[PDB]
Amino acid sequence: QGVSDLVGLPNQICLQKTTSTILKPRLISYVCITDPLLAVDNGFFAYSHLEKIGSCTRGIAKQRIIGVGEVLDRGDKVPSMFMTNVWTPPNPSTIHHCSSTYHEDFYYTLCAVSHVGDPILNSTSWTESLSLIRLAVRPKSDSGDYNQKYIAITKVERGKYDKVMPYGPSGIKQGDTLYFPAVGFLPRTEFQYNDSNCPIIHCKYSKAENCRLSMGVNSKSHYILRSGLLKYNLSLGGDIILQFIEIADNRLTIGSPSKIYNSLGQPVFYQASYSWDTMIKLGDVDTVDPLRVQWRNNSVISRPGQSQCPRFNVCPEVCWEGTYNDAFLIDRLNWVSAGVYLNSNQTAENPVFAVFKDNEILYQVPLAEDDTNAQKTITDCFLLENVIWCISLVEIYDSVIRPKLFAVKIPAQCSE
Amino acid sequence: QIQLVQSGPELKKPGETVKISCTTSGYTFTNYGLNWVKQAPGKGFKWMAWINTYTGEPTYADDFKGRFAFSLETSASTTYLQINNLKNEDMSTYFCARSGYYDGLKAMDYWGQGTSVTVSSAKTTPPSVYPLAPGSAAQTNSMVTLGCLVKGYFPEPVTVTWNSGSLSSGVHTFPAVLQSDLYTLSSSVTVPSSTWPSETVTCNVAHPASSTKVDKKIVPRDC
């Protein structure tokens, strides 16, 4: 039929390791575009980015855009994305760390409002203030606040946390409750950690403190970051009351951009591997409230780093380094996932779309020529006429630094 | 000449504190960490701790926290396992073994010889030696079995011969066991029915810790 979520019994897919190039990427996108957001749900999509002039690092931001639209067969049985509703804040320097979750007629995007820059780097001068922007996927004229609505959040229950903030590209709905990926700032003095639990076992230059010390942006940060969720329950009416849910401490690493999604009827979670646990952290969710993930013991997918915590490092070290390169579960019984990784050890480059299980990469294909620099990747997978497809956004330097979008059909067979 | 050498066997009372040493040589001390392993008598092995020789920090199992201390002296190129507040369930053999980092080989390629820790409140007690002579039941198939019971001594070892060694074959000497602080063992000798009681069979027990020598002649019973 049309486009829908990855639910039910999809068309079968190749489950054997194969170095034949059987993945056929199809580009669908055609001074700097950064801070991207992609999210795909129920034939609809949310997208965001920030356009800066000059750098990508420094540099004045000319325009922040947050859009929603439809994902449809573009004509050749290949899906692409068609914008239908776009919002622009007046001041593009005040909107940060947006994340989008879909419910029925809208896409709700939760953002941080900042006049001190990125709250991660100015964490103690940032006064926590959050907003929602609600965008209709199928807008209609002269409909007041239906197409676009802006709400300032006034009531936040942070538990034991000083400040909380959305942290990640996308979240999920359960019933009429929305859960966004988030992060809590906690004073380092109030942080409870037993260094006995830091896995230093066969690590020559690790010290048991390295876990605690790496729970913030540096060893003497005032705050540690713990990932989690922000719950917004729509059946409550009144004004918006946001609640924070901290993540369980199994395989605990620094708060980082993460993503929660539904696949084959169950919620999956991915957390970016900044710090020392450089192997990919993702898995099914045992419980939502409180948040617990059963992380895969994945031995083949990691992320690029720098001197102390490079790709494939498993030893605890004091570092804040890495990239958000997520993956999407496409087959639960064999735990197969699709995602884009940067095939290099210490430099952010060489995107590679791979389909992999915990211990082996079944198949893969690059998305550029070698040494092309890359950064954040976001992948989301869905069904088109019951065939499993994935769309992936990849930050790329060409010559403009911008997000490219690819559609990748996952094959039913392994013959080249 | 890579070798691990542990301190000698130990005899400690319940509640006391023992400190086993394991000294390494033939390689640079800090390029390998070190495991401690526990073997209970006649049972399997149990992993205790792994200590990083560069940092000095141990990674120990949950079962060995609190009254177990895994340290090292880098100068002496040696490591230590201390056990405070000793109890019966600690009587065992403790090995140290070389275990490298993720940079090399972390399997245990070289082991120490072991250290035996014995736990008893008893001071040096000699053995009580009793003879075992068969009753009226017939002497089976032209052979007879006689024995010595060596009861309630401390510490190990005793040595047990028969006819000052003359009867080496046909002898089963059994491993001693510890009960209520003292060792008991037993020994059987099997000889042709002609030779006993026509010629004498006597068993020779020696316990050097107490400076004890026993000879017990096995003589038949009227019963």
Next chain:
Amino acid sequence: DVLMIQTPLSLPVSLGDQASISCRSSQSLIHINGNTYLEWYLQKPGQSPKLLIYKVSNRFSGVPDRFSGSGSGTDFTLKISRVEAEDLGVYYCFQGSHVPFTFGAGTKLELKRADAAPTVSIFPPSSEQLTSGGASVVCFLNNFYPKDINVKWKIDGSERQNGVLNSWTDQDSKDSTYSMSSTLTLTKDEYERHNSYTCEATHKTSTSPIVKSFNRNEC
């Protein structure tokens, strides 16, 4: 903790036959750095354990080519291709992927031989020990095979389990047998309250127990 199931626990072989030990795991042993840290060790009586195989299939310096390690995930097998005398001993598998590290029960690699019922000898307390106030009845069960045996004590026909002290030898280097000793200890007084003492051996050589007895009444 991860449990390690070694099967079997006893492996009778004839010299020159081939033997194989299965070590199976409760949780997967593939570390998130891609290495599977499953090692095989051999201990001989009175000796240190010796490292045989590491990372599932890699032999250590000095190990005969007869020893081959295989497996992946949670199922691993050690293979001995022809058995030598200096092979016999106790084999331990060991996982080093998850803390705490754990071993298997151990498999005894022993020498096969024809079955052999034990020689059972019973001994009443000596006049000496009775004078001193104790009373130990002793049972010898010598030179039997296979090793698995169970001894039951009876006094005047009721089973007695309290006061029993068992000991056993390893495989005798000449006849390949096992022997065992069982001692029941009692006070002088409780021994003279009763008349018949019986020692019962259960072994695969006989469907019925091997019974040795004495009556204190008899002279």
